[PDB]
Design a protein around this ligand. Structure first.
Ligand SMILES: [K+]
Ligand SMILES: [Mg+2]
Ligand SMILES: [Mg+2]
Lengths: 140, 82, 140, 140, 140, 140, 140, 140
């Protein structure tokens, strides 16, 4: 995308043209083979806007002068967006069944906290020190 | 024969005085039932003690929720105008 | 929305026009792919009013001089609203099955506390120090 | 409502007109998508009267000079009322099934005390320090 | 009711008119959405008489100068009555199934003492310090 | 009943008229919605006679200077009678099924000792310090 | 019965008339709603004779000068007889299923020792200190 | 029986008439409602002869000058015989099913050693100190 998702804050996202937003939405839709096609644009826009806001407020600043967002900020915001979209769709599918057969997935009862609950969240979590507390500070 | 608890003997008992003083110092009201056991009321004849909360030190002590001036625990019956 | 959900307190919500409320309701409805379309307008309004009241009373104030609501207050109030609407609908579905197929969602709770019980609550809980007690205070 | 549920005690509730009570009943009914329509008015009135009584007798007073009811008293009483109605309806449904399909809800079953046993009770429990005992008192 | 259930002893219950008893029975029947309509009057009277007796013998007196029935004595005696009627009906239903239609309730392994074993009993239990032993005495 | 169940010992029960026994039997039958109507009079009389005997021998005398039967002796003996009848019927039904549907009760566990093993026994057990050993005694 | 079950030892039981034995058999048969009607007289007689011998040899003598058979000796011997008859029938049914109709009983667990393995045995066990070892002696 | 099972050793049993053995066999058959009618005489005789031999060799002598067979030796030997016959039939049925219905018994995880594995063995085991080792001896 022309403005990349790591280059826009919440107010910038609101100021983008529809095409600049659609380029970013299109990029997020690449993170699932289904593209979440049955979920409307405004839900995908809400997920991305929320991921931008949550990056800038929960996954910003420093720990021992190291950035708290240590990985690529583009892919972190895209995975954080995909995590949100998947939760708006109701969560992971653990098992799916119908006329076309049945499949069961290695979701395996992932842990208590928000980002642990989906595959996209588990990817995003590696970009931010796995939510660990390595901050240190001194008196002078 | 007179036992220590027998009604004619109570005024001779050091404990009867001491625990009536204790009850006066410890009450908030004349309403004994809300404050003392049936045992205490009978054994120390608390109906006849002048219990009313007026001799409890905590009736007179400041106990403010926010205390800027470090003034809690002060007793008003020790002010110069008393 | 014209006034944003983070800009309004409980009394302000009651003072809004129906349109300003309906804009905030429409924003909350973006957080589910189903839009909770079978719940009536009054129930969505009650959930938002409750989320605003609960934010201002339970998730307000300071904690070692840090604000207790550390994340974006807009998205916090929206996730807390979506959490409430989902609890008015029942719980989260762990599983859904019928004429057209079956699914299971891996929505196993992180614990017994209310916010842990739905995906929106688990998201909201990251905005507020995960309900931890980092308050500290001194004598002078 | 004209009188709000936090403004009325048990004796006041008995003194309200049918309409003033029906406004409060109607507000409690907003907390469920089903509104508990198949439960009669007397039972909803009894649940509210009982919630008001418990607020004033179990969840009143002070605790280390803090209020015990730390959250909004309106929503606390409504959630406590919803908890009662759901228990008069036999409890949380963990699962429901029939001709219209099957659903299973993420209730988890980890709750063992009264307020822990339904979603409305778990919400109400946040307003009252989660039943924790932070009372403190001094000699002089 | 004209005399309230907290105002009457076991002897008083036996002395009430049938109408005064029926008003109290009608109040107890408000605590279930089914009203236990298939359980006869004599059994509901026996449950209430027993609840009054058990209040006045077993949940009476003081622990330190504090009363052992801390909550509202009306709703305590009603919940204790409802607990008894539900045990005369055979216990809590954990699950019910009819003509295909099926439901399962979140009752769980709630405990092993009497009051822990029903929803009404768990409610009643919060009025009586949860059967805790905070009693204290001193020598003089 | 004319003589109450707490006013009769085993030899008194044997001396009662048939009508005086039938009044007490009728009172015990109130403790179940079913009335145990398919269990014969002799079996209900044996259960009551046994409850009277067992009260007077196992649940009598002091602990410290407290009576070991703390609660109402009438309702204790009635619950102990109902407990015995329910054991003569085979124990608590945990689950029941037939043409008319299925129900499962929350009567799981029930400890290991006899009184723990039915709802009537669990009720009776509260009248008697829960079978705890609070007796103390001294030299002089 | 004219001679009571607690008044007869093993030799006395053998010396009784058939009618005196049949009266005691009739009393034992009151302890089950089924009366064990499909088990023959000789087997019910053997169970009673055995229960008498069992009482006189294993549940006799003293602990700390207290009698070991603390409860009523009549009902102890009857429950011990009922325990034996139920063991001659194969034990307790945990579940019974017929022409569609099914029931399951809360008779699980208990323990590994014989009296723990049926409801009658669990009752009999309370009459004899629950098989505890409270004997004590001095030297001189 | 004319000679009782406790009066005969292994050599005495071999010297008995068929009628004297048949009286003892008949007495053992009283310990099951089925009488083990489908198991032949030779097998019941073998079980009794083995029970006699095993009594005299394994359950004889003294502990702290107490006899190791503390209960009635007659009933001990009969229960030991019944234990053996039930093992010759394959052990305790835990569950039985067919065209006549289904039943499941509360036999359960009864224990790992020989006598623990049947109801008759669990009975016999109480006559012999539950196989406990309370022997004591001194230097002069
Ligand atoms: K003293
Ligand atoms: Mg922060
Ligand atoms: Mg012995």
């Amino acid at each position: 995308p022309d403005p990349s998702i790591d280059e826009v804050s919440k107010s910038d996202w609101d100021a983008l043209t529809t095409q600049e937003q659609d380029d970013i939405i299109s990029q997020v839709e690449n993170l699932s083979s289904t593209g979440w096609v049955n979920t409307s644009r405004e839900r995908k826009a809400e997920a991305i806007r929320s991921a931008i806001a949550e990056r800038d407020t929960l996954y910003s600043g420093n720990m021992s002068r190291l950035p708290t967002l240590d990985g690529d900020a583009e892919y972190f915001t895209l995975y954080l967006s995909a995590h949100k979209i998947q939760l708006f769709e109701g969560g992971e599918a653990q098992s799916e069944s119908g006329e076309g057969g049945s499949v069961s997935y290695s979701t395996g009862g992932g842990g208590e906290k928000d980002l642990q609950k989906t595959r996209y969240g588990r990817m995003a979590l590696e970009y931010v020190w796995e939510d660990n507390s390595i901050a240190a500070l001194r008196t002078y | 024969m007179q036992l220590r608890r027998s009604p004619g003997m109570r005024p001779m008992d050091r404990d009867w005085h001491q625990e009536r003083a204790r009850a006066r110092e410890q009450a908030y009201s004349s309403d004994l039932t809300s404050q003392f056991s049936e045992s205490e009321i009978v054994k120390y004849e608390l109906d006849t003690a002048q219990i009313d909360g007026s001799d409890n030190p905590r009736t007179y002590i400041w106990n403010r929720t926010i205390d800027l001036f470090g003034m809690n625990g002060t007793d008003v019956r020790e002010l110069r105008n008393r």
